[PDB]
Amino acid sequence: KESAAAKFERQHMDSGNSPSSSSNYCNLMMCCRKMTQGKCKPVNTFVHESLADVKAVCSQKKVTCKNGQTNCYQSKSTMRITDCRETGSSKYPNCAYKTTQVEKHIIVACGGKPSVPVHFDASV
Amino acid sequence: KESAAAKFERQHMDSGNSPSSSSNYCNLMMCCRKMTQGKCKPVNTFVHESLADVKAVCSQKKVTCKNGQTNCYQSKSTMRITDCRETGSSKYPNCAYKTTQVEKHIIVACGGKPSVPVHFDASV
Ligand SMILES: Nc1nc2c(ncn2[C@@H]2O[C@H](COP(=O)(O)O[C@@H]3[C@H](O)[C@@H](CO)O[C@H]3n3ccc(=O)[nH]c3=O)[C@@H](O)[C@H]2O)c(=O)[nH]1
Numbered sequence A, B: 001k002e003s004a005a006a007k008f009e010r011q012h013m014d015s016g017n018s019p020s021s022s023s024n025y026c027n028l029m030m031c032c033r034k035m036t037q038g039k040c041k042p043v044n045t046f047v048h049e050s051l052a053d054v055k056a057v058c059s060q061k062k063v064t065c066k067n068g069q070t071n072c073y074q075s076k077s078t079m080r081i082t083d084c085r086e087t088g089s090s091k092y093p094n095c096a097y098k099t100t101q102v103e104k105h106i107i108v109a110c111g112g113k114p115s116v117p118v119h120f121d122a123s124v
Helices: A004-012 A022-032 A051-059 B004-012 B022-032 B051-059
Strands: A043-047 A061-063 A072-074 A079-086 A097-104 A106-111 A116-123 B043-047 B061-063 B072-074 B079-086 B097-104 B106-111 B116-123
Touching (some): A004 B043, A022 A079, A022 A097, A043 A116, A051 A072, A051 A116, B022 B079
């Protein structure tokens, strides 16, 4: 169970000199989007473009996925993305991430009908 | 179950938002700290001082609680806090918060033995 003292910590404590700094984004986002459940997802990319633009990638340049499959697509334009990668000392339940903001083309794997993104493959 | 498409959206989509966006701090924190589970917590304050300093408040100025309770103490100094308040359009499952940073004295309700902070009462 969670003690009352632990709950107060969870709900109200965030010690830090620049709590809202962009360097804390990955830590907060990976937590919020539940990618730190039982383990720390080692790498994950967030795309800051409209869902419509990302879905449209499924009808763009067809490329080969890192895994051999050929259901991957690369965006014609670059997109604003944030790479979140576990730091050296990241260790469950203390997951830690480095935030890197870049502008690159995205490669996603598409599936279903109509075709929509189902996995983030890489960026170039 | 969560579809492959919905999962892709959860893990990878953050449209119209950016890591450098400080006003989005409350949205990320309320989510990450589980205060948007099944309902939207209306108001919540995060303290950016060290935990040792917040715990020390339990031995400071005894005051009447502002919210309905007892055993409240007011910090002798001001502390850096972020006030998170639901926006007028907030509605579960779409919770939304307005972020406000400010420096004020905090009043916390203490309990346990040793006495430690268990509820956040108000900032003055
Ligand atoms: N993963 C994660 N990171 C968080 C959270 N809240 C804030 N952060 C981030 O964590 C960074 C600093 O971490 P810290 O100084 O180690 O502070 C941690 C964190 O704010 C809190 C909840 O996890 O526990 C703290 N913690 C964690 C482990 C430990 O040994 N000691 C300790 O104080 C900040 O830059 C911020 O971005 C959270 O709930 N989860």
